[PDB]
Every structure is written in C-alpha cells, then in structure tokens.
C-alpha cells in the first residue's frame, strides 16, 4: 500500500511538473561567459544560472571527469548532430557551478611542472 | 530515480521571438536600445531608468514571451500559459 | 565517525586535529627552539636550521663568527628573525645574500641589555622601558629607583597594548600610549604572568598553586586551584588558559573541570596562536582547538535540528529512495543547507569536504524556486580551493587566520624564501591581478642584485623574455628596478631598461 501511494504521488508530481516551468529572465542577464546571455542561446537552469550552449560544452571538455568527456566525444561536436536531441540531453544535465563538476575540483591534483622551474624561478 | 532526475535539468529556447509582437530576442538583430541598456548596468551602475522594463518569460514550449505583452491580454501574473 | 576524538567539558567540546610530522633522529630538537608561524629555528652546536612543519630544509645561517655571544632569538609579526646580543640587536633580511643589520644602544657606556620582548627592551640596572621603533629606540616612563624588585625574566610579559610587568609586592601596569605608570594590585606574590591577544590575564603563584584570570581589577572570573606544578603554562587564544604535565595537557574551565589530552611521546615548546594551541612534539605536530556551534550538531551523535539528518538523507540515498524522499518533509530546508554549506569550510581531510558539499548540493533542488541565494555555495566552494592549494607547499593555515592577514601577507612569506614560481601560481588560481606584478618586481630586483659576473645583453634578454608571460598593468613599476640597477656598476643596462 505504501509503495502504491508513493508511486501515485510521484506520478502526480511528475504530471504537475510538466509545462509549469514558468522560469523568468531578468532585465539584462549573463553568466560564465560574461559577455551577454542574449547573443547565442538560452541554456538556462534553475537557481538562476545562464549559459551560452558553448561555455558549458567548453567546461565539460576541460572538466577532469573522463567518462562524460569521452561520451560527448562520439559526436566530436562536428561528426554528426543527428536530431540534436542526444546533444541536448547530454549537455543539459548539470548546473555548471552548483553540481559535481566543481565539487570534484576542490583537491586539485594538477600541478604543471615541466622542468620550467629552472627558468621562472631560482 | 526518474522523479529525482527530472528536477535539476534545465531547458533551452528553440524559437527566435514571441508570436504576438514579432521582434527577436535570441538571434542576431537585437534592438540597439537593449544593448545600450545592458551597457548602463554592470559598468557604472549610474541609473537604470527606461521604458524597457519587460522581463522575458521562458516556458516548456520554448516559445518565450514578455511580461507586459502577456499583461496586455488581461492575464493575471499568476496563471501564465503558452498559446501553443 | 569523528565523535570518538571529541571530549566534553561544560556545554562545549574540544577538537584535537593532527597535521605535520617533523623528523629529528634522537635529540636534534635539543633546546633553544624558536617557533612562530611554521618557521622553526633550531640549533645544535654551531649551525642555525630553519624548517617548515613537513621536515623540509629551508635555509642555513650563523656560519662564521659574528662575535657578541648570542643569548636569545625571537620571531615577530613579519617573520624577520630578530637576534639579541649583549651590546646590540641584529636583524636578518637575506639568507643566501646575507644582509645582517645591527642596531646598537644610543650610548653604550653604562648598562647594555637585560632582556627584550616584542617591541620592548629592558636594560640590566635602572630598569627603564625602551620602545622599539623602525631602526631606533623611543624613551618611555623613567624609573625613580623605586619600581621593582624582580629577580628573573619570568616576571614580565608584553602585549599589543599593555606592558604589564609583574613584581613581588605590587603589580604596576604601564600604558604604552603615553608611558604612564598605574598601580593594579596591593597585596600579591605572583611569579608568572600570561596575557591574551584580547587583553585577558592569567597569574600563577607557585605556592598554594592557583590561577586568577583577570579582565578588570577587583573582579575574579575564576579561582581554579591547581595541584603539583606546571611547566609550560600557556594560552589557547582568548579562550582559556592551558597547563601541561610532561606527557599530558590539562585544559581547564569553570567550576574546576578537567580535560585530558594524552599524547604518545612528549610535549616540547608550545605556542598560543590565535584560536590555536599549536603543540610541537619531538616527532609530530598537533592543532588543539575548540568546536564551533554550527558544526557542533551535524557530527554530534544524536541530533534533531536541521542538519545531521540531511546528511542522513544523502547517506540513505541510492537505497530505499522513497524513505529518503519522505525524510525531506519534517525539517525546514533552510538551516540545514546553510550549516552544510558553512560546515566544510573549516575541515581538514579532503574526504569529509566532498561529502558535505554533495550533501549540501542535495539540499537545494527540493527548496523553493527563488527563496535562497546561491552565492554562498559558490563562495564556499571557491574558498576551499585556496586553502587546499596552500596546504601543498608546506604552509598550513585555517579560515579564521586567513581573515586576519590579507593574501599579500601570505605571498610575502613565500617570496621571502626565494621561491618565485610557486607564488605566481597562487595568483592564477585565486583569480587576482592586482598582486601579480609585486612578485615580478621582487624577482627582477633579486636577479639584478644577484649574480654580478653576468653580461648585459643576455641579462636584458632574460629580464625582458620573462616579462612576456605577465600581461597586467598594476604595481608593475620598473623605475625601482632601473634605480637599483643604477645603484651599482651596471649603468648601460639601467639606461636600456
């Protein structure tokens, strides 16, 4: 009975969530890229975030995560977009700054050392 | 799991403008007044005072609409519904 | 669960973290160890060694003999190691290009030195106060041959403002702003005095062992009697006095409460930094501190308020998901997410921070559409990065200490020790440009003032090729570089720059 009630509640919530977005754009807006939101596209997330559909795809390519990085590499962003639904689903999954992309970067194993210390040091 | 995965994803806009006043909000060709208005803010914060006080409204239909434009149709700002 | 380490005095807990393991074979600690801010200075027979908290060597000084047999060496607020001699005071600026400077007395005829603490001196006889200026002394209240009958140095301690000097009959405070004497007590026999940064006082008696912490005269905040004799009475930083007994620390509190902090090896010299009680052992380093209320309920065994159950929701997630979803209907999702965000800010291990951050992230989707600002989460996630990067080169610091001194204070401490590549990498990750050229100008000055047997063309080529990387215009003045080049034989290079 509890499982049936939970399933009914989940279905009702999912049905209500459809076509009820009602998200709003502020007088003038921008983020991540910095330049201007209204110049390329309107990839918008909740909790007030804005992206250009290009800065976000640049972030995932530069992100330290491996499986997601190679998963997008099948299309190479140039091979074939097909119906673009696959790219739309892949790109729009995280907030960009409030998600695991930046949380998993608080240790910074990267330390660029290429014997260049002999030049710009000592 | 399906319900949890459907509460953080965002949405884009595929259309180029609304369907009640034409114009354009996404593609190249914006009115220079909007570009000047953006320059007024985030540069010196001198004074943002202009008739351009219409915040765009994004929907699941991705069509997109203004607020004053929808207000012209005697629509209360609590039951915004796309015209499909 | 981290609750094992925590003990409990009245109404609060005290943490005991562990960071830094410095190795010395048998007794290389010996004696006469100086310690301020993770720059430990230790001698053995004829050498002075300076180390970090990670055991790496940093420099070497006291080679050859400078005469004027040394009595003490102390650090200061700018890590410029001061050395006190019999007839003058020495200050060291450059380690490899040695630049020892000396300041003598204004009249080395009668009496030279008794002792010297932070910004304050004391001569042998006719006890008088001299304030330490830039490179000279400033006179203060003059003794009328009726001040003190003190017997040893343990009868006075300096501070930022007050210069309270203990006596055997009457404690006599002196205001350093005007150098004005003022009696404080009428009947006492204290033998040891300690003072806090905020102005708190602590007075020992070494007979009927007891303590008397002071904020103002005639008011007693505590009369905690003590047993046996302490060794290194110290402070935790405007919080509570601390005492130790060889291989033990006995933290105290109101109504005579006790806290035990047993450690394996021993307790060597101890410091009393701000909100810290940095303990140096013979093999490792500890950071005894105190819990804070915002993080005192998430990890506390048994909790009901928001927090410590959002973490429970996240831990329960991935199994029995309906239960985890149903949990988020009893506690308001405002205090819990705030505490979760401002809970990983002051963590040490890079594993609890990840869990706290992802738990806090799973605290915003269920919240209202536009009711909570998202800037706090980004600010916390960005401020974790700087501390994590800092705890890689050797320097260790907390969030509160990082507030006391600006980023320039951190950059100077590492520019001092001839590490010109590390610094330039903090500025990139910290996303700053104002303090960029300040590293380059120092590096250029040191390079010009370094190797004298160079050639003008190649030196200019290097000094201008290294400028290509930097693309920023602030504090990049090279007029000083040209002047210091002109200050010595190189004139053509100075003109060409």
Residue numbers in the entry:
A (entry chain C): 797 to 918
B (entry chain F): 1181 to 1264
C (entry chain B): 3 to 499
Article sentences:
The hexameric HOPS and CORVET are evolutionarily conserved tethering complexes within the endolysosomal system of eukaryotic cells. Early endosome fusion is promoted by the Rab5 GTPase and its effector, the hexameric CORVET tethering complex, which is homologous to the lysosomal HOPS. Vps11 and Vps18 form the central core to which Vps33 and Vps16 are attached as an SM module to promote SNARE assembly. The two unique subunits determine the respective Rab specificity of the tethering complexes.
